[PDB]
Enzyme design. Structure first.
Site, PDB file in Angstrom:
ATOM      1  N   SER A   9     -24.374   0.511 -23.143  1.00 48.60           N
ATOM      2  CA  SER A   9     -23.064   1.102 -23.443  1.00 48.60           C
ATOM      3  C   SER A   9     -21.914   0.245 -22.951  1.00 48.60           C
ATOM      4  CB  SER A   9     -22.939   2.484 -22.796  1.00 48.60           C
ATOM      5  OG  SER A   9     -22.765   2.378 -21.388  1.00 48.60           O
ATOM      6  N   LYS A  39     -19.643   6.618 -24.710  1.00 49.08           N
ATOM      7  CA  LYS A  39     -20.648   5.647 -24.265  1.00 49.08           C
ATOM      8  C   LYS A  39     -21.575   5.183 -25.374  1.00 49.08           C
ATOM      9  CE  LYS A  39     -20.364   5.398 -19.509  1.00 49.08           C
ATOM     10  NZ  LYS A  39     -20.723   4.231 -18.606  1.00 49.08           N
ATOM     11  N   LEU A  60     -31.153   3.507 -12.868  1.00 50.52           N
ATOM     12  CA  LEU A  60     -31.734   2.591 -11.887  1.00 50.52           C
ATOM     13  C   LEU A  60     -32.158   3.286 -10.596  1.00 50.52           C
ATOM     14  CD1 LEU A  60     -29.176  -0.287 -12.321  1.00 50.52           C
ATOM     15  CD2 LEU A  60     -31.635  -0.448 -12.905  1.00 50.52           C
ATOM     16  N   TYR A 158     -20.435  -5.289  -4.393  1.00 46.00           N
ATOM     17  CA  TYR A 158     -20.966  -5.718  -5.682  1.00 46.00           C
ATOM     18  C   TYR A 158     -21.678  -7.080  -5.580  1.00 46.00           C
ATOM     19  CZ  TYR A 158     -20.860  -7.675 -10.418  1.00 46.00           C
ATOM     20  OH  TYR A 158     -21.207  -8.300 -11.594  1.00 46.00           O
ATOM     21  N   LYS A 162     -25.792  -7.843  -6.093  1.00 42.72           N
ATOM     22  CA  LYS A 162     -26.301  -8.783  -7.091  1.00 42.72           C
ATOM     23  C   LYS A 162     -27.085  -9.924  -6.458  1.00 42.72           C
ATOM     24  CE  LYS A 162     -25.647  -8.681 -10.938  1.00 42.72           C
ATOM     25  NZ  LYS A 162     -26.158  -7.996 -12.126  1.00 42.72           N
TER      26      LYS A 162
HETATM   27  N1  NAP Z   1     -18.285  -8.853 -17.008  1.00 46.06           N
HETATM   28  C1  NAP Z   1     -18.338  -9.809 -16.099  1.00 46.06           C
HETATM   29  O1  NAP Z   1     -17.261 -10.636 -15.783  1.00 46.06           O
HETATM   30  C2  NAP Z   1     -19.601 -10.050 -15.338  1.00 46.06           C
HETATM   31  C3  NAP Z   1     -19.703 -11.257 -14.648  1.00 46.06           C
HETATM   32  C4  NAP Z   1     -20.929 -11.633 -14.110  1.00 46.06           C
HETATM   33  C5  NAP Z   1     -21.983 -10.758 -14.243  1.00 46.06           C
HETATM   34  N2  NAP Z   1     -21.865  -9.567 -14.889  1.00 46.06           N
HETATM   35  C6  NAP Z   1     -23.062  -8.710 -15.003  1.00 46.06           C
HETATM   36  O2  NAP Z   1     -23.189  -8.295 -16.354  1.00 46.06           O
HETATM   37  C7  NAP Z   1     -23.815  -7.026 -16.393  1.00 46.06           C
HETATM   38  C8  NAP Z   1     -22.972  -6.061 -17.231  1.00 46.06           C
HETATM   39  O3  NAP Z   1     -21.641  -6.116 -16.793  1.00 46.06           O
HETATM   40  P1  NAP Z   1     -20.482  -5.441 -17.650  1.00 46.06           P
HETATM   41  O4  NAP Z   1     -19.118  -6.129 -17.478  1.00 46.06           O
HETATM   42  O5  NAP Z   1     -20.969  -5.265 -19.015  1.00 46.06           O
HETATM   43  O6  NAP Z   1     -20.255  -4.026 -16.906  1.00 46.06           O
HETATM   44  P2  NAP Z   1     -20.274  -2.512 -17.513  1.00 46.06           P
HETATM   45  O7  NAP Z   1     -19.346  -2.442 -18.706  1.00 46.06           O
HETATM   46  O8  NAP Z   1     -20.021  -1.626 -16.377  1.00 46.06           O
HETATM   47  O9  NAP Z   1     -21.795  -2.324 -17.918  1.00 46.06           O
HETATM   48  C9  NAP Z   1     -22.673  -1.935 -16.895  1.00 46.06           C
HETATM   49  C10 NAP Z   1     -23.481  -0.758 -17.417  1.00 46.06           C
HETATM   50  O10 NAP Z   1     -24.408  -0.337 -16.432  1.00 46.06           O
HETATM   51  C11 NAP Z   1     -24.674   1.033 -16.595  1.00 46.06           C
HETATM   52  N3  NAP Z   1     -24.997   1.627 -15.275  1.00 46.06           N
HETATM   53  C12 NAP Z   1     -24.221   1.785 -14.183  1.00 46.06           C
HETATM   54  N4  NAP Z   1     -24.939   2.342 -13.198  1.00 46.06           N
HETATM   55  C13 NAP Z   1     -26.189   2.534 -13.654  1.00 46.06           C
HETATM   56  C14 NAP Z   1     -27.337   3.056 -13.077  1.00 46.06           C
HETATM   57  N5  NAP Z   1     -27.324   3.544 -11.840  1.00 46.06           N
HETATM   58  N6  NAP Z   1     -28.480   3.118 -13.829  1.00 46.06           N
HETATM   59  C15 NAP Z   1     -28.515   2.651 -15.126  1.00 46.06           C
HETATM   60  N7  NAP Z   1     -27.367   2.129 -15.691  1.00 46.06           N
HETATM   61  C16 NAP Z   1     -26.240   2.067 -14.958  1.00 46.06           C
HETATM   62  C17 NAP Z   1     -23.475   1.656 -17.311  1.00 46.06           C
HETATM   63  O11 NAP Z   1     -23.881   2.360 -18.487  1.00 46.06           O
HETATM   64  P3  NAP Z   1     -24.113   3.961 -18.579  1.00 46.06           P
HETATM   65  O12 NAP Z   1     -22.920   4.594 -17.956  1.00 46.06           O
HETATM   66  O13 NAP Z   1     -24.331   4.352 -20.025  1.00 46.06           O
HETATM   67  O14 NAP Z   1     -25.407   4.363 -17.865  1.00 46.06           O
HETATM   68  C18 NAP Z   1     -22.637   0.466 -17.754  1.00 46.06           C
HETATM   69  O15 NAP Z   1     -22.381   0.571 -19.131  1.00 46.06           O
HETATM   70  C19 NAP Z   1     -24.006  -6.588 -14.938  1.00 46.06           C
HETATM   71  O16 NAP Z   1     -25.346  -6.850 -14.511  1.00 46.06           O
HETATM   72  C20 NAP Z   1     -23.014  -7.436 -14.175  1.00 46.06           C
HETATM   73  O17 NAP Z   1     -23.315  -7.689 -12.809  1.00 46.06           O
HETATM   74  C21 NAP Z   1     -20.686  -9.192 -15.458  1.00 46.06           C
HETATM   75  O1  DQH Z   2     -19.741 -10.461 -11.782  1.00 48.83           O
HETATM   76  C1  DQH Z   2     -18.593 -10.847 -11.904  1.00 48.83           C
HETATM   77  C2  DQH Z   2     -17.463  -9.874 -11.983  1.00 48.83           C
HETATM   78  C3  DQH Z   2     -17.603  -8.604 -12.553  1.00 48.83           C
HETATM   79  O2  DQH Z   2     -18.802  -8.188 -13.093  1.00 48.83           O
HETATM   80  C4  DQH Z   2     -16.498  -7.768 -12.582  1.00 48.83           C
HETATM   81  C5  DQH Z   2     -15.272  -8.200 -12.050  1.00 48.83           C
HETATM   82  O3  DQH Z   2     -14.190  -7.404 -12.051  1.00 48.83           O
HETATM   83  C6  DQH Z   2     -15.146  -9.460 -11.469  1.00 48.83           C
HETATM   84  C7  DQH Z   2     -16.250 -10.302 -11.442  1.00 48.83           C
HETATM   85  O4  DQH Z   2     -16.130 -11.569 -10.895  1.00 48.83           O
HETATM   86  C8  DQH Z   2     -17.255 -12.427 -10.712  1.00 48.83           C
HETATM   87  C9  DQH Z   2     -16.872 -13.839 -10.369  1.00 48.83           C
HETATM   88  C10 DQH Z   2     -16.189 -14.796 -11.180  1.00 48.83           C
HETATM   89  C11 DQH Z   2     -15.946 -16.082 -10.632  1.00 48.83           C
HETATM   90  C12 DQH Z   2     -16.360 -16.389  -9.315  1.00 48.83           C
HETATM   91  O5  DQH Z   2     -16.161 -17.620  -8.755  1.00 48.83           O
HETATM   92  C13 DQH Z   2     -17.010 -15.418  -8.554  1.00 48.83           C
HETATM   93  O6  DQH Z   2     -17.445 -15.604  -7.259  1.00 48.83           O
HETATM   94  C14 DQH Z   2     -17.257 -14.174  -9.100  1.00 48.83           C
HETATM   95  C15 DQH Z   2     -18.206 -12.299 -11.888  1.00 48.83           C
HETATM   96  O7  DQH Z   2     -19.368 -13.141 -11.805  1.00 48.83           O
END
Ligand code: NAP
Ligand code: DQH
Length: 324
Positions: A9, A39, A60, A158, A162
């Site tokens: 979602s 969602k 999770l 956070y 991770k």
């Molecule tokens: N966006 C970024 O800049 C960024 C950067 C680096 C890494 N990431 C990684 O990318 C992935 C997705 O990030 P995103 O930006 O797409 O965030 P997001 O929009 O919050 O997506 C995360 C999803 O996780 C689900 N969730 C939350 N708690 C949960 C739980 N306890 N059990 C099962 N599902 C759960 C939620 O869906 P529901 O509410 O439907 O359950 C939500 O839609 C994450 O692993 C994050 O660490 C993101």
């Molecule tokens: O998971 C990530 C993340 C995210 O999911 C949500 C958000 O609001 C900020 C974030 O910022 C992270 C990031 C970017 C550049 C960096 O140099 C660093 O240390 C971390 C990214 O990876």
């Protein structure tokens, strides 16, 4: 073939399911609450959803909850994660479920017998959270958990969840001979199909919103376009030569340089021209995606593409005002 996307979602989850379905995959999408229309509607609205998309309820925090969705799958993308930066009980509400959910999903794959590769979406927070910033990071680099917990910068809990989850997962994978790949995005920016504000766009558009608390992540920032990232997930799942960790980051620049670009594209917003504790002499920090591009992957989008997509979409969905 048949793949599971956890957290379908969300910002990355929903775009990945879209690209996956477009590529001809059968997708099993997990969500915590299938009754939530905000969602799931954007998932159901996708072409091939009627024929190639199923929904599965899972959290999770619950042991074994992904067993059913994963049984039968040839591949799994573990994208879901707890995104609260403001939790009063970080250990229980964020860290523990991120780690235990991760290991649960690896066990669920093991139970399945069908999963040939698990791809985990890690975080740059697992790489460059330490007091001194190197000029360029690669996949050998891991965050300093003692520093992170002590400093408590924005998003510390956070970043901890991770980092610990990825290290746990590599431990499991090594000890069980599991074909496991991690992708380490930096800040993901772009258009999107979900209806609410992407968590990362809170950070990425902080120069427009004035959310100064998120400046610390973009002070020396790195970026990747949502679509490039999602294409990289598919690429690494498909490429048999893939092994280990993979950074996915296309651009780096300091907050000063970001805000300039934004000011120029969006005169209507109150975007500062100066930031406390930041100088034109501040080093930009690069996350190198050379490991990824060496396999043959190609980035296709620019920083301007990302941010224009981001802001334009936010406006369209009434998440940003037309001007200030
Ligand atoms: N966006 C970024 O800049 C960024 C950067 C680096 C890494 N990431 C990684 O990318 C992935 C997705 O990030 P995103 O930006 O797409 O965030 P997001 O929009 O919050 O997506 C995360 C999803 O996780 C689900 N969730 C939350 N708690 C949960 C739980 N306890 N059990 C099962 N599902 C759960 C939620 O869906 P529901 O509410 O439907 O359950 C939500 O839609 C994450 O692993 C994050 O660490 C993101
Ligand atoms: O998971 C990530 C993340 C995210 O999911 C949500 C958000 O609001 C900020 C974030 O910022 C992270 C990031 C970017 C550049 C960096 O140099 C660093 O240390 C971390 C990214 O990876």
């Amino acid at each position: 073939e048949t793949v599971c996307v956890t957290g379908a979602s969300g910002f990355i989850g929903s775009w990945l399911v879209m690209r996956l379905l477009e590529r001809g995959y059968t997708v099993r999408a997990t969500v915590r609450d299938p009754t939530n229309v905000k969602k799931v509607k954007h998932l159901l609205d996708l072409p091939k959803a009627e024929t190639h998309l199923t929904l599965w309820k899972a959290d999770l925090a619950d042991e074994g909850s992904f067993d059913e969705a994963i049984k039968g799958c040839t591949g799994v993308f573990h994208v879901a994660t707890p995104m609260d930066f403001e939790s009063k009980d970080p250990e229980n509400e964020v860290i523990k479920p991120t780690i235990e959910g991760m290991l649960g999903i690896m066990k669920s794959c093991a139970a399945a017998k069908t999963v040939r590769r698990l791809v985990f979406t890690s975080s740059a927070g697992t790489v460059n959270i330490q007091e001194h910033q190197l000029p360029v990071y690669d996949e050998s680099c891991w965050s300093d958990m003692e520093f992170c917990r002590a400093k408590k910068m924005t998003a510390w809990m956070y970043f901890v969840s991770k980092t610990l989850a990825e290290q746990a997962a590599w431990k499991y994978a090594k000890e069980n001979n599991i074909d496991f790949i991690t992708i380490i995005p930096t800040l993901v920016v772009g258009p999107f199909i979900m209806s609410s504000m992407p968590p990362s766009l809170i950070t990425a558009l902080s120069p427009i919103t004035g959310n100064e608390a998120h400046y610390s992540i973009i002070r020396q920032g790195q970026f990747v376009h949502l679509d490039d990232l999602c294409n990289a997930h598919i690429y690494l799942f498909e490429n048999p030569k893939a092994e280990g960790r993979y950074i996915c980051s296309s651009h780096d620049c300091i907050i000063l340089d970001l805000a300039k670009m934004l000011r120029e594209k969006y005169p209507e917003y109150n975007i500062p021209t100066e930031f406390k504790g930041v100088d034109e002499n501040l080093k930009s920090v690069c996350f190198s995606s050379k490991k990824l591009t060496d396999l043959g992957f190609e980035f296709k989008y620019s920083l301007e593409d990302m941010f224009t997509g981001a802001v334009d979409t936010c406006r369209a969905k009434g998440l940003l005002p037309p001007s200030h």
